[PDB]
Amino acid sequence: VNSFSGYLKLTDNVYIKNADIVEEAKKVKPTVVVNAANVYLKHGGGVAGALNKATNNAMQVESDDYIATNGPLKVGGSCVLSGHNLAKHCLHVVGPNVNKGEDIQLLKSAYENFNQHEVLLAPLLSAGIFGADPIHSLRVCVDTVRTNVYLAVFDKNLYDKLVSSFL
């Protein structure tokens, strides 16, 4: 049993809810929250900007030190950093950004990072301002992630479309 409430079960391991991932993290304090990161861990907008704002910029301060030591992530890659006030850990995952011309085939590699964690609270990778089709992102999630993933979809209209269209 876990603390996640009000999710619709899509598969054996994938759950979905219309929720603000920031508000959801604050309530649940999950072991792992996933950030929709970029390779520079520059948390300006979308999920990264909202998560980072909720940490009072501590996520950005930690991230800048990580990049100064390690250099940029790979598209499709990840790193584990603090979850600050939102979670034990934040798994920063880089999905391909279609609005920068990145190979959408890298979305499966991105979701494979989730399999290193038994339970996660996550957004749909490469959705929102990363420009991918969220229906596609949910299909790759279901077909790639084998651990237990709780998906927070920000947009109510999109949430209803994802559920209604799910195969």
Ligand X SMILES: Cc1ccc(O)c(C(=O)O)c1
Pairing state between β 8-9 and 78-82: unpaired
Query: Binding of ligand X at residue 153 (CB under 6 A)?
Result: yes
Amino acid at residue number 121: L
Nearest one of 104, 117, 125, 137 to 47, comparing CA atoms: 125
User: For residue 148, how many other CB atoms are within 10 A of its CB?
Assistant: 16
**What mask of x and - would describe binding to ligand X in positions 96 to 125, judged by CB under 6 A?**
---------------------------xx-
Q: Taking CB under 6 A as the rule, does residue 21 contact ligand X?
A: yes
Task: For residue 52, give every residue at least 6 positions away whose Cβ sits within 8 Å of its Cβ, in sequence order, or none.
Answer: 43, 59, 60
The region of 5-13, 19-27, 76-84, 109-117 touching ligand X under the rule CB under 6 A is 19-27
* Per-residue tokens: 105: 């085939």
The least CB distance from residue 155 to ligand X, in Å, is 7
Q: Does 95 bind ligand X (CB under 6 A)?
A: no
Residue from 50, 91, 140, 145 that binds ligand X (CB under 6 A)?
A: 50
Three-state DSSP at 107 gives helix
Is residue 47 a contact residue for ligand X (CB under 6 A)?
Answer: yes
Chain residues in the site for ligand X (CB under 6 A): 20-22, 46-47, 50, 123-124, 127-128, 153-154
